Every structure is written in structure tokens, then in C-alpha cells.
Amino acid sequence: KTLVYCSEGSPEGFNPQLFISGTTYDASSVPLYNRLVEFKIGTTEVIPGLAEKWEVSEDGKTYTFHLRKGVKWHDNKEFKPTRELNADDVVFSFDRQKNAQNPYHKVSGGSYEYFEGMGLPELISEVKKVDDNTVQFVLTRPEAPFLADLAMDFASILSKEYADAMMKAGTPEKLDLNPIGTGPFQLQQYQKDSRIRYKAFDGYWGTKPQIDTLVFSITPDASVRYAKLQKNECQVMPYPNPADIARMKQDKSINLMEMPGLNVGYLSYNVQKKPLDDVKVRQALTYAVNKDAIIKAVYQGAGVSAKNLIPPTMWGYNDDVQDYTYDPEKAKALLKEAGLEKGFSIDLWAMPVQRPYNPNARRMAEMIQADWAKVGVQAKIVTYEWGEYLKRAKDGEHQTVMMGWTGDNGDPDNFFATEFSCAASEQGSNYSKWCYKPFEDLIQPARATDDHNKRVELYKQAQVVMHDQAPALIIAHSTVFEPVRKEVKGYVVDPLGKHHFENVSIE
């Protein structure tokens, strides 16, 4: 009947539209609300949510959503709904973020950060009501990742009946502070320095949670989380201390669940800077490096070797690629064919901050400098303060630079196109400055088409092109660790990084 989760900090609010933090999302969008479309648990595949089906026009610019009938809203001290979900609720949700003429646009400050971050103000031409159970979106271009954007937490549907009411009582901020949703749990109590209490929503459209009472115990210190887990004061916890992983692995009261994180760490080769314009040279520098040694010494169990830009938790992953080996002799042969038998000198920018996809860039750089020296390549390690590092790398001032990415929507486009397209190169966030027609000929059709099978084919071939042309040395993906006590049944780790309790039971 009850499950206690040791959370890592307090939510900023209960309206996910206004925030970008996973800590906040775990306490709001995940338990209380639903989206039009949802991610299938354990994957980044999209399925029906508050919309039982969708249709896409021939030109890829008009989306039709046919809404689910009979969906109930929560209630509170002040609100009791008189109708179920409809198109008004859905249009209000997106119109509030896009339209400055909407009465709720400036409410609670109007910071619609992810909405804006995903480019929706510009992409969306119009959001319209067709009837009470049908909504359309017309876009300014074809955009296959738009469905994955609508499964994101900021796209949670709010109640228009309740918003009207709170604007009527002259207390519109209550829509944001006292949540009303369609989700599996309802909010019962909250106290910022202590805990959050939820209860299974009896009216839920989906299958009712098997957990009757869900409690969040706000615990910022990770050592105290594990201590609480050991006492059975909480049954689930996130982000263990790196130091505790070995013990947790031997702890017979828990399953230490693991998964690749939604990210990647790489070293870009600026193909505009000689001799890095020659594919043979890029290949040589890649063969020369002893990547197993780097994974071991730098990540120390919190990462895994990467051979593809996207992690294996995403769809479209090509498991047929065979990664570069560690082969100095082949690197020397390559260098000779390139007419650089004698090596050359080059710079190597090391990240000044620590990230899951690259936790020790200084050590890594020293390792790569040692590897390259053996094939005659004398590297100069450079670094700058984070803002400056970013600004100069964005203008292509580097010869080689360590960078990475964390996924936003779980869609392959959000890695290949944002980081390695011709447009990204113009923009500067393609740090390889690689604009290649065979690549463009795969990622542009892939982002315009609606045929998922065709999308899978295209992204798998794109992984071949990247591998053959070696625009970047791909290094790794992080490893995520989630301790769960054995009495908890049905918990699945989420590739997008949220922590979900609506499908679990407790023994």
C-alpha cells in the first residue's frame, strides 16, 4: 500500500511548463499529469497518451490528434470538475506558452523555457480546436521529432475549467501552485523541508497504481539516502555516491539497476584545419588511442565505450557497427599514406567542467597526448574557463576539442542533426565543422518523413557514414545506477532520466 522514495531535493513548483529540472519533473509531470503522447516505459518509443491516435498530412505539416473520451481530472479543496478532458484543455495548454495575448501567459512569470528551447514558438504556426475531442497543429515545416517533443514534461495538459475558476477567484497563481491533472497520482500534502505525499488517483483513465500512498522524503545528501535505504526508511533512491557503488553491488537487500545514460562524450576534429581535412588522418588519430584504458581510468565504472553517437537505449541504434581498434601500427601506415610519415603538431582542448559523459577531461587529455606522441603527433593541451571555452569553440578557434551532448527528447534527430549537420556547422555547435552530403542525404529525409520504419533505416546508415568519415573520436556514454530494495516489483529504469512509480507494487 505504501512506497517511500528518497528524492534528491525539493521541487521548484508543480506546473512543469515553467521548469526544466528532473527533480521538479519527478514531483509534478511524472506523477500528476499526462501528455498527448507518451514514451513507452524503458524506451524512447512514442505511444498514445491523452490522444488515442494521431494523423499526419501528406505534406507533413498538419497534425490531427483524436482525444481519449472519459478522462477524469483530480479535485481539491477549491476545485471539483464538472466535465472530463476535451480540446479546450489541450489548446489552452500550448496557447498559454506561445500567445502573449492569453490571460495566463504572464502568470507566475511566464518562463516557458523548454517550450522555447525546443523551437516551438517558431515551428508551430497554429494550434486549433476542430471539435470538443479533436485538435490540430499546423507547423511551418515537416518535423518528425514533433511527436517526441509532445511527450516531454513541459507538454503536460492543464485544466482549462480549473484555470478559468482560479482566474475568476482572482488567484490565477493557484493553477501553478495547487495542481490539478489527469495523472495516476494526486497531491495530498507538501512541506518543502520534509516531504511530499501522494495517493493513487481512483478516477484514473489508465490502470490504477498498485501503490496506494506514495511519499517523497527530500534528502539532498546521497550518503543519508543510502543509509535510509538500508534501514528500509525508503525503498528507492537516485544518484548514489560514486564511492558507494561497490558496496551496493554486494548488498543482498537491493537490486542495483543499471542503464546507459541519454548522452555522449566526444573529441571533435575541425576538418577545416589541415591536416584534419584528410579522412586518413582522422582515422589515424582514432586508431592510435587506447580507449579501453581511458574508459577504465577516467570513468571507473560510471561509463561505457561508445561506437555510435546515440546510446543503445534509443531506437535506430546500429549494433552492426564494429568500433575502431587500438592499433598504432595501422595509425602509422595511415599517416604515411596521407604523406605525414613524420607526424605533426596539434592542439587538444580539454573540458574545464565535469560531466556524466566525461568526468575527468584533464586525465583523458593526458592519456590521448601520450597515445598520439607514439605515432609522431605532438599535442598541446589547452583549456579556458567554461563560458570562454564555449564561446571560442563555437567560432572554430580550436584544432581538436572535447565536447558532448545530453538528449532532450529521445529522438535520433536531436543528436545527429543538432551536433553534426551542415546547419549546426554554420551555427558553430557542430565542432567538427563537418558538412557532408552523404550524411545530409540521410538526416534531412529522416527528419521530414512520417514512416518510422524508413526513419530507422536512415539513422542506421547515418551511423555507418559517421564511422567511415570519423569527424569525431566517439568516446563513451555514462552509466546510470538506481538502487531499488527487492520488495519493490515492476520498477523499470527510464532512458529519459525520470523516476516512475505508477507501474510498481510492493511486497
From Swiss-Prot:
Activity regulation per the record?
Heme binding is inhibited by dipeptide.
Intrachain disulfide bonds: C6-C234, C422-C435
Q: Which Pfam family name is an example for this entry?
A: SBP_bac_5
Q: Which GO terms describe its biological process?
A: chaperone-mediated protein folding; dipeptide transport; heme transmembrane transport; heme transport; positive chemotaxis; protein transport
Q: Which InterPro entries match?
A: DppA_dipep, Peptide/Ni-bd, SBP_5, SBP_5_CS, SBP_5_dom
Q: Read off the CDD domains from this record.
A: PBP2_DppA_like
Give the domain of life.
Bacteria
Q: Which GO terms describe its cellular component?
A: ATP-binding cassette (ABC) transporter complex, substrate-binding subunit-containing; membrane; outer membrane-bounded periplasmic space
Keyword Transport appears in the UniProt entry: yes
- Keyword DNA-binding set for record: no
Q: How does it assemble?
A: The complex is composed of two ATP-binding proteins (DppD and DppF), two transmembrane proteins (DppB and DppC) and a solute-binding protein (DppA).
Recorded domain comment: Consists of two distinct domains (I and II) connected by two strands that presumably function as a hinge. Undergoes conformational change upon substrate binding.
Recorded family membership: Belongs to the bacterial solute-binding protein 5 family.
- Described purpose of this protein according to its UniProt entry: Part of the ABC transporter DppABCDF involved in dipeptide transport. Binds dipeptides and accepts a wide range of side chains, including small neutral, bulky hydrophobic, and positively and negatively charged groups. Tripeptides are poor substrates. DppA alone controls the specificity of the Dpp transporter. In addition, plays a role in chemotaxis toward peptides via interaction with the chemotaxis protein Tap.
Q: Provide the protein name.
A: Dipeptide-binding protein
